[PDB]
Design a protein around this ligand. Structure first.
Ligand SMILES: CCCCCCCCCCCCC/C=C/[C@H](O)[C@H](N)CO
Lengths: 246, 293, 41, 246, 46
């Protein structure tokens, strides 16, 4: 009576039967820009159906010695979908996402997964050198991995010098393979500015960490994937211009 | 009326946690044993991300306590009310150094003890209360006079000791003596943005971004807010090695989006770079699992 | 009762401290507001 | 909605999720001694928290050829707990117990357990001799086993000449490893006298009999234990005196 | 009033199966077939 779940945005319609409890980040639904705070004097655009779909990212396989994965938003959607072709043509942007991540496993398997959004998820150069002109820094494809989503190198400090043990201050939901095969988050627009660029400023991150390692007795499915389906809500766009890849 | 689909959502595009004012600690009422099925507060589901609400009354035979412990000191307003070190300048006015001035760009990330506090909150908004303590390298005070000009972004920076920028007909300046109690100044929220950002998951500019060394990463300018210069008020150089600490207070603070506390040591100023070779584990290492010290 | 000797707002010290705590924003950020002592699943 | 269970007495708080249905012996809650029936003219004492806790006895392992176990009440609690130090210092006593016994097993295992309280559970000398001066008799440690709890020798007659097949007239609850891993009984004070001694007269017994033998396909947990957690309610004490071990 | 903890339980220390007088055997009424889910008296839990 609570385990089922029906979320439908746009022409999509997702359902999960075993996972339960939608967690809403910070108790505020995603809403449009109010009149009394916007700065973009021109009219913004509200497609509301073409863009507000459940785009599905690629499957990431979970191994018994896996480390973790992460993505950036709205960076994962700039080459694909009408939302991609809408962000390349607009300087300004505002939206609120409905994260949803899936990890299917059998009732004989074990394991858990920490799923959390990370606002303003910067990364950190991995090196003891403090020379300012020779400082190690993460590359572009490392911090903006795109639709694929790169992996971690040391997840215990989130590759940012912040311990994972405290990482539940952020909105989160646990996938645990005994009771739920899926999780979901509805996050509003979190930014100190009413609008922002879409191909420069990522609003937040997402982490999917194998805290408890996948362990199964030999003789079962060995290739467990993880898929994340993402869906913006109450999107905005303004300041039309030419295309810009990056 | 022409088509229902456009008036339906627009009418239903209206606005979609009334927490109370807690003055004291939370008291408790008594509770007796209750031996019944169906009703359990222990067996929660932390997997939903919620906090378990297993209150003390609902677990044990509690009592009645009307608490009185004040929560006044734990709020953020009085948590950042403490002033703290921010920077030092080295105005080495002597015979060798033929400059007579020292410029320092405001960066509170330079010192850890104030840094680690503001890292707990991702977006902050506050007004500042700067305090410029003044002394020599020996700790000695002397009969001299200093000038403390704020140089905003875009202003002409000073060039020397006799520079025309010290005419300061628009730039705010503090003329103060060295035999003086410390100068103290209030500063408002002078961001171009609506709130400060200690983090930025991207770049200031558009265009290509290399993957070999990304020095422009994680540098939002909305918090980057110009420089602050000092000279001794004199057209010829007096030989003294000066070093003035600068302190700030945070008042009228409003935080947003709490962030975990950084455990690893800091290595740089504007980048949170740790070292993979020495991961400082937060918890101290114990003997075995079942040997609580 | 707190007083400001300047006509600007940002020269005050503790002009209004406030008790306002909302554990529901972070501790229970849930759609289906679960019951206080029942079975969540 | 009925499988969960939360019993909390004293500072303890027990929970069982799979077992269901509290059975109350004879439909009368445990109550204090009424004014119109007590004989102890002195004031009795009502600690009600120190003593009314869920004391946990020792684990008894279940083997595939096991026979049974049994205990005596309040004999199991005279050396341990504040209730032990309260019964050694008082000639008179009255309480009502909240039995609770646990036997955890997997959903692949099978087996059942008969749990029942036995009022005035005397035992019987196991021997064909009827010589009155040479009659076989059970030893003290056999009839008052203490906190450990001894085993049976022939459970089909309960070591008292009473068949186990009729043993369900007493208050009982079955542990069966397909549907419940635990059981519980709330028993009142059953005694023909309002108060009694605590280190002489045991009010009742408890039996945990493996009727259906534990059977599992090889390759699983072989060591199944049984723990019993016990909790007196509405205890009384009177006639203070020196210590008495036995 | 001095402390609520002592007056609470004492007030709630009050007394915590009204079977009828059966003179004859128990009769029975008729019953028809009933083909419905959710309602079962056979599958009890002994
Ligand atoms: C003549 C008065 C001199 C004092 C005025 C100096 C300007 C003070 C402006 C304060 C700006 C906010 C605090 C600065 C914090 C950090 O430096 C930046 N957020 C980033 O590093």
């Amino acid at each position: 009576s609570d385990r089922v779940a029906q979320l439908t945005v746009g022409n999509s319609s997702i359902t999960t039967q075993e996972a339960a409890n939608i967690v809403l980040a910070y108790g505020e639904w995603p809403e449009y820009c109010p009149d009394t705070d916007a700065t973009a004097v021109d009219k913004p655009t509200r497609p509301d159906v073409s863009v507000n779909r459940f785009y599905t990212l690629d499957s990431k396989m979970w191994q018994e010695n896996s480390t973790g994965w992460y993505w950036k938003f709205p960076d994962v959607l700039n080459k694909t979908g009408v939302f991609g072709q809408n962000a390349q043509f607009h300087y300004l942007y505002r939206s609120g996402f409905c994260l949803h991540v899936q990890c299917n496993a059998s009732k004989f398997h074990q394991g858990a997964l920490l799923v959390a959004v990370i606002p303003e998820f910067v990364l950190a150069g991995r090196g003891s050198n403090t020379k300012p002109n020779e400082a190690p820094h993460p590359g572009f494809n490392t911090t903006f991995p795109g639709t694929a989503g790169a992996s971690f190198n040391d997840p215990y400090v989130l590759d940012s010098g912040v311990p994972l043990s405290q990482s539940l201050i952020y909105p989160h939901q646990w996938i645990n393979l005994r009771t739920n095969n899926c999780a979901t988050i509805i996050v509003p627009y979190i930014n100190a500015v009413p609008f922002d660029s879409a191909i420069n400023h990522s609003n937040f991150g997402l982490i999917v960490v194998p805290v408890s390692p996948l362990k199964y007795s030999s003789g079962a499915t060995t290739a467990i994937p993880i898929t994340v389906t993402i869906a913006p809500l109450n999107s905005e766009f303004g300041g039309l211009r030419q295309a810009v890849s990056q | 009326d022409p088509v229902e689909d456009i008036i339906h959502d627009a009418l239903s595009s209206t606005v979609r946690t009334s927490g109370q004012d807690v003055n004291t600690a939370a008291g408790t009422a008594p509770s007796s044993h209750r031996l019944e099925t169906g009703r359990v507060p222990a067996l929660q589901a932390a997997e939903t991300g919620a906090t378990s609400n297993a209150t003390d009354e609902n677990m044990i035979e509690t009592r009645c306590v009307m608490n009185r412990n004040g929560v006044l000191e734990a709020t953020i307003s009085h948590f950042f009310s403490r002033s703290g070190l921010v920077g030092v300048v080295n105005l080495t006015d002597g015979g060798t150094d033929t400059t007579g001035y020292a410029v320092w760009d405001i960066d509170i990330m330079g010192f850890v003890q104030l840094r680690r506090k503001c890292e707990m909150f991702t977006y902050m908004r506050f007004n500042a209360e700067f305090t410029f303590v003044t002394t020599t390298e020996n700790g000695e005070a002397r009969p001299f006079m200093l000038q403390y000009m704020y140089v905003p972004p875009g202003a002409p920076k000073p060039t020397g000791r006799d520079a025309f920028q010290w005419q300061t007909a628009t730039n705010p300046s503090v003329f103060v003596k060295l035999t003086d109690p410390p100068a103290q100044v209030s500063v408002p929220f002078m961001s171009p943005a609506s709130a400060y950002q200690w983090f930025y998951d991207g770049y200031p500019t558009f265009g290509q971004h290399p993957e070999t060394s990304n020095t422009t990463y994680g540098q939002c300018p909305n918090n980057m807010m110009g420089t602050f210069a000092v000279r001794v008020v004199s057209r010829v150089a007096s030989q003294l090695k000066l070093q003035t600490r600068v302190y700030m207070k945070l008042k009228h603070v409003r935080a947003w989006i709490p962030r975990p506390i950084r455990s690893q040591p800091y290595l740089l100023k504007n980048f949170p770079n740790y070292d993979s070779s020495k991961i400082t584990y937060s918890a101290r290492d114990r003997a075995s699992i079942k040997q609580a010290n | 009762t707190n007083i400001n000797y300047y006509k600007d707002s940002y020269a005050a010290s503790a002009s209004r401290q406030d008790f306002t705590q909302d554990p529901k924003k972070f501790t229970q950020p849930v759609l289906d507001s679960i019951r206080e002592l029942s079975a969540p699943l």
